[PDB]
């Protein structure tokens, strides 16, 4: 505790849900600084110590808490999901905004890049594709990973390397849970 | 582990010196809320949600106390082993595609934060901007470090440049992540 | 509508 001697602890509870509540896994992690020393795992069903640092806690924890923790899987995990998640986060549907833009200059023959910006949507599941005259392009195509905005919305940018021509129609097709019908944006020279 | 959904109901972060703490609820990697430990109030990131669910702030205070307790016990046991300083990384990108004169938001995502103490600020052309700024709590990472995001509302102009300034004990000199309407 | 939370267990 002399001068720049920083100390912190972390408690990280986890309710892993698979297929609604058909399967739940409850994990409770006990971290000292950045080191996980103790851990409860519903799969294992017991407070096993992770590292040396957590040697002194196992026995005591399984004594005093084992029963109280196993229960949280129902009173905390299943409960919060069915009683609070269902009406809020699991019901959140924000529709994507979709726009196409060219990376360089508009002229009559350039190896440019079309960018399809898909933004402010929720939840994560989404599908974005490029078409050139009705045929899907997959070769000079790339999309960023899912970008989490931190405000409960995502965005993904999808690039298509191409060479514009006359009467050539490019389309960005987006399918998302919030859209009863897919969105299609068009771009021409 | 894996799943279709992940809930973290009661993340506790307590550090010293300073008795600095944080209590949050996450779902699918997003902040449901954080309990304001001074106001003793649950602060929901999405107001609408608070209309349908709730959480007694006392639960956070009770557990933040246990954080004060377990820490110390562990600071004594670890033979007083201090935390090792990591170096933060920042990325800047707009919420929506940039259009001259149209209201947007600039986002600064700072990752690999450890310990969870940091100052993140915005510079319009090289001058600190303090209005229209919002910051998230500290999100947990798989490796136990943290990320956090800051936001700046702004109007895109040809005569404007931006920088996200991050200050951390793991940097020798404040990091400036530059950004400007391309 | 009242959410629960995982309790952080004390040591010693």
């Amino acid at each position: 505790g002399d001068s720049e001697r920083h100390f912190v602890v972390q408690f990280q509870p986890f309710c892993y849900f698979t297929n609604g509540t058909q399967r739940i896994r409850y994990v409770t992690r006990y971290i000292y600084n950045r080191e996980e020393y103790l851990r409860f795992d519903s799969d294992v069903g017991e407070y096993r110590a992770v590292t040396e640092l957590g040697r002194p806690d196992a026995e005591y924890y399984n004594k005093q808490y084992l029963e109280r923790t196993r229960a949280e899987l129902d009173t905390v995990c299943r409960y919060n999901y069915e009683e609070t998640e269902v009406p809020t986060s699991l019901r959140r549907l924000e529709q994507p905004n979709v726009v196409i833009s060219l990376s360089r200059t508009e002229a009559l023959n350039h190896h440019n890049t079309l960018v399809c910006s898909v933004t402010d949507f929720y939840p994560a599941k989404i599908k974005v594709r490029w078409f050139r005259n009705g045929q899907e392009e997959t070769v000079g195509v790339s999309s960023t990973q899912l970008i989490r905005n931190g405000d409960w919305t995502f965005q993904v940018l999808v690039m298509l390397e191409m060479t514009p021509r006359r009467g050539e129609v490019y389309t960005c097709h987006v399918e998302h849970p919030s859209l009863k019908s897919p969105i299609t944006v068009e771009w021409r020279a | 582990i894996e799943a279709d959904h992940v809930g973290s109901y009661g993340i506790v972060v307590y550090q010293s010196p300073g008795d600095i703490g944080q209590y949050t609820f996450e779902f699918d990697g997003d902040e449901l809320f954080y309990v304001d430990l001074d106001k003793k109030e649950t602060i929901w990131m999405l107001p609408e949600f608070a209309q349908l669910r709730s959480f007694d702030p006392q639960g956070g205070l009770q557990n933040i106390a246990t954080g004060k307790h377990n820490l110390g016990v562990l600071t004594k046991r670890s033979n007083s082993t201090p935390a090792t300083n990591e170096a933060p990384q920042a990325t800047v990108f707009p919420k929506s595609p940039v259009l001259l004169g149209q209201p947007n938001t600039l986002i600064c995502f700072v990752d690999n934060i450890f310990p969870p103490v940091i100052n993140i600020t915005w510079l319009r052309n090289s001058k600190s901007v303090a209005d229209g700024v919002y910051e998230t709590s500290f999100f947990v990472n798989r490796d136990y470090s943290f990320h956090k995001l800051s936001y700046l509302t702004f109007i895109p102009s040809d005569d404007d440049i931006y920088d996200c300034k991050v200050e951390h004990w793991g940097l020798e000199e404040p990091v400036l992540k530059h950004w400007e309407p391309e | 509508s009242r959410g629960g939370a995982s309790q952080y267990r004390p040591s010693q």
Partner: T-cell receptor
Amino acid sequence: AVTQSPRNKVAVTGEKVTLSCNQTNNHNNMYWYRQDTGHGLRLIYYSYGAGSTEKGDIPDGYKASRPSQENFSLTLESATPSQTSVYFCASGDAGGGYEQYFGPGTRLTVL
Amino acid sequence: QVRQSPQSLTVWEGETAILNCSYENSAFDYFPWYQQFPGEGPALLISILSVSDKKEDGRFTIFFNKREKKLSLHIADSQPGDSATYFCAASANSGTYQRFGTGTKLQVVP
């Protein structure tokens, strides 16, 4: 193994009564109750125990103080007849799903 | 809040004393019953989790009915010595404090 200062005290309206408690159980949580015919036990003030203090169900007219792990005191800065009862101090683990240990009690009368 | 049906009860040694309790906060997950003998403070007798629906320990058995938010403590084979005031408490899935009830006074006639 919980102790309370006045095991019985009689004061007058307006007086500044101060019941105090002590617990060796080395518990983090401490509570102050009051038993009354028709209400059973009612939490008044409690602590996560450092220099912590939180309002219970009926905190009005009261103020608590937890100067140390084992000391939790209840204070009435202006006694009232409505405060004539039996005060029960208690201690337990951080939590609420944990067993609570009570003291003997304390009868108080203001007049 | 917590409620205890039997405002007061008297039974002759050997029978079965049934106590009742109810609450209406589905978030309640832990319910401990305290026993208080005249002269001293209350003390924890038997506690149950919302997970199960029954808990036994001697003559004492808690009957927990998740829905309808009912709950009851059965003392089979009564006995003078079990005669004080019993308290039904409860706490939520968050870690908040326990909330007791009116409390039933039991008298066991030898």
